[PDB]
Amino acid sequence: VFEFLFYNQQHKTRNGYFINHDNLMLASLEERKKLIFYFIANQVPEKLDPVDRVKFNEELSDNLSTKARLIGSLTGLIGLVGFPYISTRIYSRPVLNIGLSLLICPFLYYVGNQLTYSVWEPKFIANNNTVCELSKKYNFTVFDFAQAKKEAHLKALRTELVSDNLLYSPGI
Amino acid sequence: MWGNLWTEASYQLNFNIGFSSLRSDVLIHLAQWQYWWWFWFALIWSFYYFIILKVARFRVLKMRPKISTSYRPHGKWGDFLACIIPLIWCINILTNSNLILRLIEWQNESSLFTVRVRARQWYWIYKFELKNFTDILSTPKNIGNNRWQIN
Amino acid sequence: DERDCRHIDICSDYKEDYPYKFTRSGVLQQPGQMYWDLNKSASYYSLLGLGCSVFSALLFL
Amino acid sequence: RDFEYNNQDVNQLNGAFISLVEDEKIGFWVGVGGFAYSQFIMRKFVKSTNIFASVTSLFAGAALANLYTHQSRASYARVAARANRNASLALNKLMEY
Amino acid sequence: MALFFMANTAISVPSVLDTSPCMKQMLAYEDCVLDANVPQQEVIHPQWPTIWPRLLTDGKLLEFDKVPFHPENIYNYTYMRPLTKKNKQYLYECEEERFVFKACLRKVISLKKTDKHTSWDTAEVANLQLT
Amino acid sequence: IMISMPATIKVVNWTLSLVNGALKIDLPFLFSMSFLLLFLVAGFTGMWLSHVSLNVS
Amino acid sequence: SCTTRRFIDEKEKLEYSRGYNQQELEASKLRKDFVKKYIVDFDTTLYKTQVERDWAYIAKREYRYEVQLKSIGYGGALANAVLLWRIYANKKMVFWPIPIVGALGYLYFQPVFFQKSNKRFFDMCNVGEEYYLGRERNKILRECNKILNVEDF
Amino acid sequence: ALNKRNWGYNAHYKPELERSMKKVLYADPNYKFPIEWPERYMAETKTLEQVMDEEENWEYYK
Amino acid sequence: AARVRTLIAAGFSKEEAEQVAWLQNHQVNGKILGLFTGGFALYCCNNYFHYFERYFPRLRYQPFTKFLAQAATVYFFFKIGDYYFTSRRYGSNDARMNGLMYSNTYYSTNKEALIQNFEPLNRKFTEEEVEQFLRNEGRSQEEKRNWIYNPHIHGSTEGEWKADIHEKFDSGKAPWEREHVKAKILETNKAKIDAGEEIQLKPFKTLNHLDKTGLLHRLHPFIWTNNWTLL
Amino acid sequence: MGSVWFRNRYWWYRSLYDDYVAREAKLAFGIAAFIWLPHYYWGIHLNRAFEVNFSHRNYAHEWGPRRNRLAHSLEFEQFDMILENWQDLEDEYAQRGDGML
Amino acid sequence: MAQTAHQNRYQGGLCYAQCNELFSFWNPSIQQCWKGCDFGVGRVNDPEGRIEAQQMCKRWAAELYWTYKGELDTIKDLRVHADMYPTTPQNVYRACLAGVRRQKF
Amino acid sequence: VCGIYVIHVIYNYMIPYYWVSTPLKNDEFTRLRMKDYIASTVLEEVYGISYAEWGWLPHDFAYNRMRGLAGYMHPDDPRAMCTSTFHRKHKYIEHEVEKVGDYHHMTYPK
Amino acid sequence: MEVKYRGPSDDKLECEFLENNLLSCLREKSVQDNVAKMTCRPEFLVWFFLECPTKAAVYHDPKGLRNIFIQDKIKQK
Amino acid sequence: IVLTWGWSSFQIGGYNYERFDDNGERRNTLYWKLSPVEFPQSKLWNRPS
Amino acid sequence: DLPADYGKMPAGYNFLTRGKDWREYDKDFILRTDAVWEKFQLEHFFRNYMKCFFFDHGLKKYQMFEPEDMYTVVFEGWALDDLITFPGFTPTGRTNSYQIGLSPRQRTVVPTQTFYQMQDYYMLCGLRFERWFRCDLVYHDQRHTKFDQVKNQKNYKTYPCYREYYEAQYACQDDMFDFLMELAYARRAADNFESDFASHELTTLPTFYDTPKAAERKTYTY
Amino acid sequence: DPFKKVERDYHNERSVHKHFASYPLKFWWGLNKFETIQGIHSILGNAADLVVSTLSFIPGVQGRNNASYIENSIRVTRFRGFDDKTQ
Numbered sequence A: 001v002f003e004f005l006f007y008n009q010q011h012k013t014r015n016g017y018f019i020n021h022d023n024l025m026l027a028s029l030e031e032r033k034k035l036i037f038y039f040i041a042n043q044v045p046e047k048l049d050p051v052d053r054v055k056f057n058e059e060l061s062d063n064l065s066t067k068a069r070l071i072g073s074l075t076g077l078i079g080l081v082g083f084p085y086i087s088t089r090i091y092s093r094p095v096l097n098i099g100l101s102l103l104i105c106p107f108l109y110y111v112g113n114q115l116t117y118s119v120w121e122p123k124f125i126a127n128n129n130t131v132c133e134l135s136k137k138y139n140f141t142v143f144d145f146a147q148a149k150k151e152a153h154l155k156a157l158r159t160e161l162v163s164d165n166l167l168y169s170p171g172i
Numbered sequence B: 001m002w003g004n005l006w007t008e009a010s011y012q013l014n015f016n017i018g019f020s021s022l023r024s025d026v027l028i029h030l031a032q033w034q035y036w037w038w039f040w041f042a043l044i045w046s047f048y049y050f051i052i053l054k055v056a057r058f059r060v061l062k063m064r065p066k067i068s069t070s071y072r073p074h075g076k077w078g079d080f081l082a083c084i085i086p087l088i089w090c091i092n093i094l095t096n097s098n099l100i101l102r103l104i105e106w107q108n109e110s111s112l113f114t115v116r117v118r119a120r121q122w123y124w125i126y127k128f129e130l131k132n133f134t135d136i137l138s139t140p141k142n143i144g145n146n147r148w149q150i151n
Numbered sequence C: 001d002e003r004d005c006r007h008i009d010i011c012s013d014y015k016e017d018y019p020y021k022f023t024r025s026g027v028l029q030q031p032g033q034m035y036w037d038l039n040k041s042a043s044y045y046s047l048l049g050l051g052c053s054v055f056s057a058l059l060f061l
Numbered sequence D: 001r002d003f004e005y006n007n008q009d010v011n012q013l014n015g016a017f018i019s020l021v022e023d024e025k026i027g028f029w030v031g032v033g034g035f036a037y038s039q040f041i042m043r044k045f046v047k048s049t050n051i052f053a054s055v056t057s058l059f060a061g062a063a064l065a066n067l068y069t070h071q072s073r074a075s076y077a078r079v080a081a082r083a084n085r086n087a088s089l090a091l092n093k094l095m096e097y
Numbered sequence E: 001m002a003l004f005f006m007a008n009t010a011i012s013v014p015s016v017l018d019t020s021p022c023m024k025q026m027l028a029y030e031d032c033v034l035d036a037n038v039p040q041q042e043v044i045h046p047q048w049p050t051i052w053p054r055l056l057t058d059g060k061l062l063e064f065d066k067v068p069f070h071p072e073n074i075y076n077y078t079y080m081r082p083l084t085k086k087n088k089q090y091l092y093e094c095e096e097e098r099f100v101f102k103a104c105l106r107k108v109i110s111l112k113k114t115d116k117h118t119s120w121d122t123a124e125v126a127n128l129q130l131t
Numbered sequence F: 001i002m003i004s005m006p007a008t009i010k011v012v013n014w015t016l017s018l019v020n021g022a023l024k025i026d027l028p029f030l031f032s033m034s035f036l037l038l039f040l041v042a043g044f045t046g047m048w049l050s051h052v053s054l055n056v057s
Numbered sequence G: 001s002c003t004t005r006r007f008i009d010e011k012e013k014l015e016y017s018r019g020y021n022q023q024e025l026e027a028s029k030l031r032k033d034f035v036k037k038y039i040v041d042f043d044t045t046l047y048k049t050q051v052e053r054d055w056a057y058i059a060k061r062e063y064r065y066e067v068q069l070k071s072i073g074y075g076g077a078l079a080n081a082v083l084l085w086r087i088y089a090n091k092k093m094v095f096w097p098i099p100i101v102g103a104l105g106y107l108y109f110q111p112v113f114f115q116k117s118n119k120r121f122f123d124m125c126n127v128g129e130e131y132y133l134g135r136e137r138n139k140i141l142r143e144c145n146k147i148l149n150v151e152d153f
Numbered sequence H: 001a002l003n004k005r006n007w008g009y010n011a012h013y014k015p016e017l018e019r020s021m022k023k024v025l026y027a028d029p030n031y032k033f034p035i036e037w038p039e040r041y042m043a044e045t046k047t048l049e050q051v052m053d054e055e056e057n058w059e060y061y062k
Numbered sequence I: 001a002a003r004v005r006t007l008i009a010a011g012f013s014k015e016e017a018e019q020v021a022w023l024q025n026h027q028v029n030g031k032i033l034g035l036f037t038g039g040f041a042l043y044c045c046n047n048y049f050h051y052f053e054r055y056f057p058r059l060r061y062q063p064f065t066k067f068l069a070q071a072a073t074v075y076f077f078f079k080i081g082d083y084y085f086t087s088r089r090y091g092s093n094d095a096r097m098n099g100l101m102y103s104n105t106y107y108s109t110n111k112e113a114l115i116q117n118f119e120p121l122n123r124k125f126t127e128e129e130v131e132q133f134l135r136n137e138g139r140s141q142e143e144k145r146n147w148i149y150n151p152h153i154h155g156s157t158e159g160e161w162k163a164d165i166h167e168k169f170d171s172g173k174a175p176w177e178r179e180h181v182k183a184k185i186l187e188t189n190k191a192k193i194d195a196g197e198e199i200q201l202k203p204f205k206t207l208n209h210l211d212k213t214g215l216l217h218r219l220h221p222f223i224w225t226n227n228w229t230l231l
Numbered sequence J: 001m002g003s004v005w006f007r008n009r010y011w012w013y014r015s016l017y018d019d020y021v022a023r024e025a026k027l028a029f030g031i032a033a034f035i036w037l038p039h040y041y042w043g044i045h046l047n048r049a050f051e052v053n054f055s056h057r058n059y060a061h062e063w064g065p066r067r068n069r070l071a072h073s074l075e076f077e078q079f080d081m082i083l084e085n086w087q088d089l090e091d092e093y094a095q096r097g098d099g100m101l
Numbered sequence K: 001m002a003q004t005a006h007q008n009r010y011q012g013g014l015c016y017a018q019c020n021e022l023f024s025f026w027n028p029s030i031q032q033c034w035k036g037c038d039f040g041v042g043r044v045n046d047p048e049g050r051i052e053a054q055q056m057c058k059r060w061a062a063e064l065y066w067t068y069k070g071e072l073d074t075i076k077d078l079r080v081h082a083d084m085y086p087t088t089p090q091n092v093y094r095a096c097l098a099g100v101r102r103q104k105f
Numbered sequence L: 001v002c003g004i005y006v007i008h009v010i011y012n013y014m015i016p017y018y019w020v021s022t023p024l025k026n027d028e029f030t031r032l033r034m035k036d037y038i039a040s041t042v043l044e045e046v047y048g049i050s051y052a053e054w055g056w057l058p059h060d061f062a063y064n065r066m067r068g069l070a071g072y073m074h075p076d077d078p079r080a081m082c083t084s085t086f087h088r089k090h091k092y093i094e095h096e097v098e099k100v101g102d103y104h105h106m107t108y109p110k
Numbered sequence M: 001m002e003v004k005y006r007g008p009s010d011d012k013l014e015c016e017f018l019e020n021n022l023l024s025c026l027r028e029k030s031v032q033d034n035v036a037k038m039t040c041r042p043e044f045l046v047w048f049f050l051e052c053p054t055k056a057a058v059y060h061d062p063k064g065l066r067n068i069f070i071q072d073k074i075k076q077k
Numbered sequence N: 001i002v003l004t005w006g007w008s009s010f011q012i013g014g015y016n017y018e019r020f021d022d023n024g025e026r027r028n029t030l031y032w033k034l035s036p037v038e039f040p041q042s043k044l045w046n047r048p049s
Numbered sequence O: 001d002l003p004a005d006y007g008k009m010p011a012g013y014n015f016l017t018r019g020k021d022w023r024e025y026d027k028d029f030i031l032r033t034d035a036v037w038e039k040f041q042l043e044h045f046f047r048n049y050m051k052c053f054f055f056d057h058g059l060k061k062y063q064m065f066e067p068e069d070m071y072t073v074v075f076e077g078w079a080l081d082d083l084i085t086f087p088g089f090t091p092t093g094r095t096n097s098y099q100i101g102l103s104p105r106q107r108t109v110v111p112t113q114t115f116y117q118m119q120d121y122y123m124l125c126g127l128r129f130e131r132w133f134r135c136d137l138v139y140h141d142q143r144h145t146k147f148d149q150v151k152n153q154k155n156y157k158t159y160p161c162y163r164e165y166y167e168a169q170y171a172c173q174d175d176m177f178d179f180l181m182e183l184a185y186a187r188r189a190a191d192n193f194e195s196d197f198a199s200h201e202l203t204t205l206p207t208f209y210d211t212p213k214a215a216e217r218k219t220y221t222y
Numbered sequence P: 001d002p003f004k005k006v007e008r009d010y011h012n013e014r015s016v017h018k019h020f021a022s023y024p025l026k027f028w029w030g031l032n033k034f035e036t037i038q039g040i041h042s043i044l045g046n047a048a049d050l051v052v053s054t055l056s057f058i059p060g061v062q063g064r065n066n067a068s069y070i071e072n073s074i075r076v077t078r079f080r081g082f083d084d085k086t087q
């Protein structure tokens, strides 16, 4: 019942995947358009045009995608204080040192990325002029949102299914 | 050989080891059966490797002789236990034969053509019936994507 | 062309029939004495000689 | 024209969202206060390291915030589950061809 | 044999990939002709209208001056019958396929073996033969 | 095909009796070993000839 | 056939001995990229058409034997030689040299083998325009032919 | 329904070409073929002259 | 093993949720079986871990090596379970051998079909398709709706509307299968056509690509436990 | 496998033959696996060759006559093109009766 | 059952099982009725399915034995006798029709 | 075991042959068919086809299925009534057929 | 199955026979089989396409075909 | 004698023959797609049968 | 689908294709890149496969001889015999390359399953010959005036025992046919019917197949 | 090129984008299933939002406007239905 470690969990709590029809049950019409555009562009940019996808991806990187990575990197570097934390002249344990450093750094990176996302996603999504322009251009419907959600769930299932045999895949 | 299509199918050379030609399905099946039978006997021969060496190294009078106090034998299931090896070979042979025979036997009435082979003293005679000639005109042709047309 | 690697006018299936005549490239090719192979052998021999000479010079000290 | 969300479900969702926002603000304030109190208490009588004290303070603050935000978040989750289930079923029945 | 007699099942052995130039067009023309069910057997050739025009005129494919013509059944000397209008009608249903097949054959005829085919030795290996 | 069942018993009995004994090599013993070796191949040839397809071939 | 395979292998060895040129080197790099992406690192079971899957699996088996297995064997031979020298030095059986030199030799001979049968592997991709893999292979072959000023098949 | 299959009945030609007129003809519910698949392989009993007369006196379905 | 209610929470039909749950349950149950099998080993061969210290002296001297070896054993058991459940393991689609997990045929076929047959819509649903879906409210019931053509309300011709009404509802031709809709979609997504990206008209039919019973791939069921006979 | 599966091996021993070759059997099994690898590899190669032969035979049965008919049709189409050119020439000769001559 | 669609007689199904009740133990009519029931799979519940099944049965019977055009359309009695061997195309067509009639669901 | 094999030959090969001897006015063909089918359908002669991929290779199965289906062409064969289905794909892997009941001819497997 | 290899022969006598058959076929079928005596054997013409392929180039050459037509008209005259 | 050659001689000989003699095939064939496959050695010489 | 008479054969459609721009069908076809090599191989295979004849220059014509041993072709080439002219695969030159199958089996009078238990058709040949002899004796004398042996072949009728005679000829061999024909000649010179002396059924066991009301036995059902 | 990261290719559409190195390194994200961990993350986010408003008093940065329904929904539903069982 520890599937949280046995299954992928990084893709869940980011990129606006938490939004669903229930949220659109309370948003305004322009708010619904903006939310639909953001969710569709994030989860399934294939349905959108290529130039628009490129612009939206650039905006997402300038807003959260690169920023959350930078914040996580800063947190990990903070956690990287004193790589030989347990070191002695008699013996320096490289195994224990590298293991502790690896255990500390990923948690700090995840914390920093999560903090940056949870802090800037409302501001970036709500008050992006480019996102508003894209929402005006697209104006996705509820049927579009449902189809996009189904496609995103299928893609999420495929991602775990694709990396099912990462050791030896003769294919039979 | 009719033209460049060399119809000679055997073409076996002198001092041949195996069958003449593997162009026949029966010959291919027989060769495969022989190779498989030769493949799966390993363990058997293995015992033969170990029995000879032990007898020739620790059973002689000058090397570990044994005082056999065996008034009578008391085996009960030895023959049935050892019979599994003959049973397996028999089953394999029967399966191979039934597979080969089922494609070349009990199929006379469903024949595309008919020929009579009468072997006379120092000669053979091949007789073709009149109806066979008509059958020659009545052969279906699989033209196109597996479409059968009868002229 | 010297580097044609097709010295006999036969396909990979060798659809031609013996005697399989040689090709124009095979006209010029010398088996095992071409420039590339000879240079490869020369380079192996030079590397071995340089290693042995360096080892001897170190021992000569 | 497009599909419209159910009325009663929409009203329940709106009420739950308002309550959730208010409870979130209250819980954030309560969690800050609890973190401060935990830091003080640990510095008072606990003979331990500052790292352990800070970890205990953060954990206790998160626990206090969760305790203050249990009922509201749970009700919001239940309402969202029911609404999303109904909406998904209706939409799937609509687009099925 | 047995359940495990050969001990190796060569599932990798795939069906031999056919590499005929205009096989698809030829088979489509053949299927259309078969659906039409034209009594004349020579119609199977794409160039049949240009091969024996007498079939469209009287069905007089060959001269029977020396060999007597003694028909016995309907399926006798079928090459000696003109194309019936109904059949001709069914012949019109496949005109597009016949024209496409003829165009494909002509395009294949226009092809040549130029000197730029440096892989002339490595043909079968390219043509899905290294099984 | 079923006839080979008794022959295998005889071969097994010979092989087993040859083992775990006090071997006193005489000229007779070599001839018995040669007889066993010859009987080994003949049984296999007969069993192979018992196949209907092989016999027809 | 077997004779065709022998001729192909011998011609590949002779060509690798003759040289690799510059335009041929770039074409080999492109072909290696295509084989690695669409064949070597792409599971053949993912292809839409079953026939495409079969052809890709045949090509993948050829790569596994002609490139991966041959490189593994060469690396293992190099590792055995190095381990023999080391055991001669220490008069005892070491453990690191086997795996270390095996990995180094696999990395080294991995490209060289991929350098020899670069064309041959490409020859296993000519499924035809009826397959998406076939269309991509045709585009790649057209690019290589434009680069090399020669008409391949 | 899962196991229901054609079993090779009335296997008419399915033209894959887009420019195939017969396709459109095959789309017409009033289209008539030259002969029924059940009878396409049946032995012809009519006389040659009668068959020729009947074929000459034939009208298109369209 | 997916909280089947949650699967329907996202885009998933009751049958589609069942298929997704079957696939996820297969993967997760394989991994969990491997992990739990690893657990009993450490609860049993813990002494065997200590006894194997004469052959490997550093373990008796370096305590952390014991924990590393325990983790290695757990990982080995988990990987063994995964290979037993999440590997390729192709086998014969035989009715007497299917069902029993001598091979991973069902899960492998489902995963391969899902990977091969899934692609995004690559475009937006047309308003006519949206309108047709909007007009499809409850029209899928068992009783065929008596569509009445009112010239004051439907306009056009009575027969023309009746044929149009049949095509929209009675005939069942999809809005993605409409000629006008196809032409409009061709006119709209030209930008994507400027990149040569194919347009998917029908959404990915989950019921047409996954089957827990495996009937879609036509794999015969277990002989001993299936009354129905496939093919 | 061997004496382990039985609860009274002695009995079991006698119950077969009243003779003991157990160590021989164990060493023989080990050597037998170690040797059985190679014949398996060779048989795999041979079976692959046989399967290739069967596939080639099936393909020749299916594609041979079709390829022959296609070649005949190609020759006929080339002849038809040549005949069309010759018919154009004949039409010119009709338009140019003796001028072409 | 080489021409049938089931590996085993027990796998033939009730329809095929009814075939065993249709004729005696000494007639290939059992195999003929099994083939007919196979032809009727997924078409019995449909009227156009039954029509197409009759056409398919006629086509199969014509393919089996060479008969004149329309000869099977002159069968005096479509009813079958338990002692009817598959000797004639009319008998084959009658057996196929009975097998189609015996297919439920 | 041999006697059981012999008893099967005794009960199904000789005594029925000793039953009917002379031409009969009433159902002579029926009696002869019953007698022959009582002997021509011994399972030991036909039961192989059920598990045929064990002896038929992948491409060999496709090559022989055409002859095997054509082998039982004439319906007048009571023993053919006992043979398993010749319209089955290769158990391991079939190279040609995708759907079993999807053929281009009522008598040709492809 | 095992078919040997033998390239196109292009023999002078066989080429002459094939060319005569091809010329007769052209002269006859140019009238759409509306001639006096059907003397052409189409299968033989097929050999002309494969036995004298070099001469086929003359058939594929427009000026060569025109000269051949002129010569054939002179011969028929 | 007893073990080594009895399980390696035939396979080694077949490998050497196929490697150096190409299974003794005639060279003038049309296409491997439509030609009979000349299989390698299959009747084991080291085997008594 | 624009015209109402679309698909109707155009009037006077000669079906000729003189001067047709083939570029229209270019989009309707796909050609492999190895087309040149494939065409060359196909042409070579056609030249070396169907051509089972050799063009003799002396007669300037293709000739053929019966199939013989390859050595006889090679080691005995200079002594060719039985040379004939090439007739062609068809009188009109049509192609005969097609997969062969089995034609529908003809209706049989004597069922082969009656004595199918034997690999040698001795009893089967005997029964078939007896039936054919009964049929012939029924319809012997009228052949010259009421069967295919009539003079006016426009009124020729297939002999009523044609099917039985052909089935018997298939069942029996040449020697068996000769012996049966001699016995039949004796029996016909006797003109003695089998029923003229039949007594075996008087000592035959009763059977349900021999009930008095024979028509009442067959319970017809559909 | 980002455009190269946008092309629709089947091989790209079926490529395993996660290497084994991502198996351990990204393993920390799974703690979100824990209610206490989610609450700690939310508290950190709230403190960061307060500090962000305090810094957005300076020009160029706009604070978290309490009238934004989108922002409120994002904050209240960022972890609304996290479930490792899904996907």
Ligand code: HEA
Binding pocket: B041, F001, F003, F004, F007, F008, F011, F039, F040, F042, F043, F044, F046, F047, F049, F050, F051, F055
């Ligand atoms: C004394 C002589 C003798 C003995 C002992 C046998 C014993 C056997 N014979 Fe035969 N046989 C003949 C003398 C003998 N035979 C003669 C003279 C002919 C020809 C008559 C004529 O000219 O036509 C003949 C013909 C003959 C034929 C047909 C040849 C022909 O068509 O005429 C057949 C096939 O069924 C056959 C089979 C057998 C079998 C199956 C045994 C079995 O008893 C033997 C099989 C027993 C075993 C198999 C046990 C061996 C134990 C093992 C465990 C072997 C396994 C070992 C390895 C694989 C390493 N024999």
